[PDB]
Amino acid sequence: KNNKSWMKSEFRVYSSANNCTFEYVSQPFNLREFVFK
């Protein structure tokens, strides 16, 4: 939008996060296939 670039403006995920018990965060930086268990 006007700036000829792409950037994040929304993180419309959640409104509270009271008791936190696990956290991990990566080091910072087609077909995609996944299995979850």
Binding site: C20, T21, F22, E23, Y24
Partner: protein, 49 residues
């Protein structure tokens, strides 16, 4: 947990989550400052394994 500059009052006793990490007594227990180290459900040597 221990080296922190200003503790809570008992009336305001803090509490930490310790998780996803390795918990040694190897330093902790052997620091000669601890006037008390009293364990009820396990003996002090069996905490590491």
């Amino acid at each position: 947990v221990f080296n922190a500059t200003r503790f809570a009052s008992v009336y305001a006793w803090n509490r930490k989550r310790i998780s996803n990490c390795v918990a040694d007594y190897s330093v902790l227990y052997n620091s000669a400052s601890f006037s008390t180290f009293k364990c009820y459900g396990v003996s002090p040597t069996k905490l590491n394994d």
